[PDB]
């Protein structure tokens, strides 16, 4: 309903961009359009962030001359302020008295357009939309500025207060593997513990903090918990909460250093959990219906059948379209007309075929294995998986297709075949089949309608389909004598005999209910050679770097540079209408075939043809656009950069992605707007960044007082 900075009282909040006012950053962005990309985007963002914040902190410092002891927290949001020639160290009762003095005697905006410097406290956390400051300086808050912005800016409804204790009644804090319950998940608790309607069973997205009475908060959690009355204890996984990696009172408390303070506080029964709900997972329509996604890894404990179902692999169909196992609930299965075994389709709000492996009574999530849906990038912190009925009124794309493009855009890299889930079993079955296909029994089967004896899951299915109970006892009995043979088990020993039926049926034949062909079900999905090829033709990667954790402008300034993600998206849409998906799919399917069991000639010619399609400008720009969309989205957390290795052997690095976005658009060479260039192995040949910055601050000061005489 309202932001978590206000619903808990930790931070006071002020707005950075006022009521519908013009976006002054979008207007500076055509200085880059005029100059053809020789000003710095992140420098322009800083000037905007420093003006909006200086105007907002000030507008509060006067409206709070009447709430004076609430003003003192906004005082320590600016240390020193240079206005004209005088300097205001706000820590002084003297300078701050003078600061509020000229405040009233002079008007707004135009006066702000006349400060020179500004330095912010470590207390203030700047973002693209707000500025946060802790309510009480008494306590201390043990998480970095990015995690404050990640956790406390999200709107949640009224927060709860759950006890944290190891023994007795409360929430326990287990120390498991990181992401053990899934990436975006961070705990399992019951519906009745956070006040949900009786025996709710799904997943809910929360924004909790872990505090003590004295106002200190040691960890903040961002992500989802799994709600289910079937688990015993409300428990939170410590290693999935944001903790440490910040500076309190001059010292840097690492992730491990804060973990000890909690273990000490948790032992003393003086540790709570202030948690707020952001969205409870319903099953709602979209045709199609959708709900949140949960990892199968978080049902290991409770309802293990869901886990074991989705852990035993995925299978590629006859055309190469992977069919992923999901687990849905009663409401969704009804509205989408699906029962167990049905094939459907699913996507995150890439499109994959889905195999219903189970249906639950009260579930309202879409439980999937995540390693098999990495092609649709499902992160379990509130991503909604849509499911569609069995009608299949569309062409689902083939594994080689999107895994290759995803690789040509550096979002995946070597050609590796998969891991056959039934490798050892099918070997043993093929040795028996050499003898079975010769036997009279094989003729009995082919006379009853079962002519292809190569698929064990089909012969057993096609037999119990059309009666023939006796021709199934003989088949199940022949494979017993054959496998006991082939594995050296004595069919008489009643424990050795119990090992046959434990390997042949339980471990193999019983899985005919989930999979069609055991020869096409994998445990680790392969990497098609066209994808390994496609990733060596475009040498594009997304380089990771953290925003300056000491300067609060760096994050907010970085988040402003995200306000043109839409132009990155239109470029992708406007580009994919050109690429002939028919020719690309056949060009890929040809190379993967000629690679696997092709002659020495075609592995060369199929390579040279696919290479010329991927060195094509329309294709290269579409994949490069797809990369920029991910980089821009990620820059809302870190100072990510683009890196490209060209035919010169050099590698170029970019942090002016709008200029890059312009150069791709009008089909211009993109190397001039770059920020730094490297010499293959050697590095830092041109450092263009310092020049673009001071010229930006110069061309700014020019454009300003020139429009004002
Ligand atoms: Mg997500």
Numbering used by the authors: 327 to 612, 680 to 742, 750 to 812, 821 to 1117
Publication passage describing the model:
Many bacterial and eukaryotic viruses with double-stranded DNA genomes in the realms Duplodnaviria and Varidnaviria encode homologs of cellular RNAPs (collectively denoted “two-barrel RNAPs”). The TMP-fused virion RNAP transcribes pre-early phage genes, including a gene that encodes another, non-virion RNAP, that transcribes early and some middle phage genes. Transcription by vRNAP and nvRNAP is directed by dissimilar AT-rich and GC-rich promoters, respectively, and the two phage RNAPs have distinct overall architectures, with the TMP-fused vRNAP being unusually flat and lacking the clamp domain.
For structural analysis of gp96 vRNAP, the shortest gp96 fragment possessing the RNAP activity was delineated using a fast cell-free assay system. The shortest fragment of gp96 that retained RNAP activity encompassed residues 327–1124. We crystallized the 1–1200 and 327–1124 fragments and determined their structures at 3.1 Å and 4.4 Å resolution, respectively. The structure of the 1–1200 fragment was largely the same as the structure of the 327–1124 fragment because most of the flanking regions not essential for the activity were disordered, except for two helices at the C-terminus (1125–1162). By contrast, the virion RNAP adopts a unique flat structure without a clamp. In contrast, gp96 vRNAP contains no defined domain at the corresponding position, resulting in a clamp-less, flat structure that heretofore has not been observed for any RNAP. We hypothesize that this unique structure enables the passage of gp96 vRNAP through the narrow channel in the phage tail. Gp96 is exceptional as it lacks the C-terminal region, and its connector element, which is disordered in the gp96 crystals (gp96 613–679), is twice shorter than in QDE-1 and phi14:2. The disordered region is likely positioned close to the RNA-DNA hybrid duplex during transcription elongation and might dynamically interact with the nascent RNA strand, moving similarly to the clamp domains of other RNAPs. We hypothesize that the vRNAP is associated with the pore formed by the TMP in the bacterial cell envelope and transcribes pre-early phage genes concomitantly with the phage genome translocation through the pore.
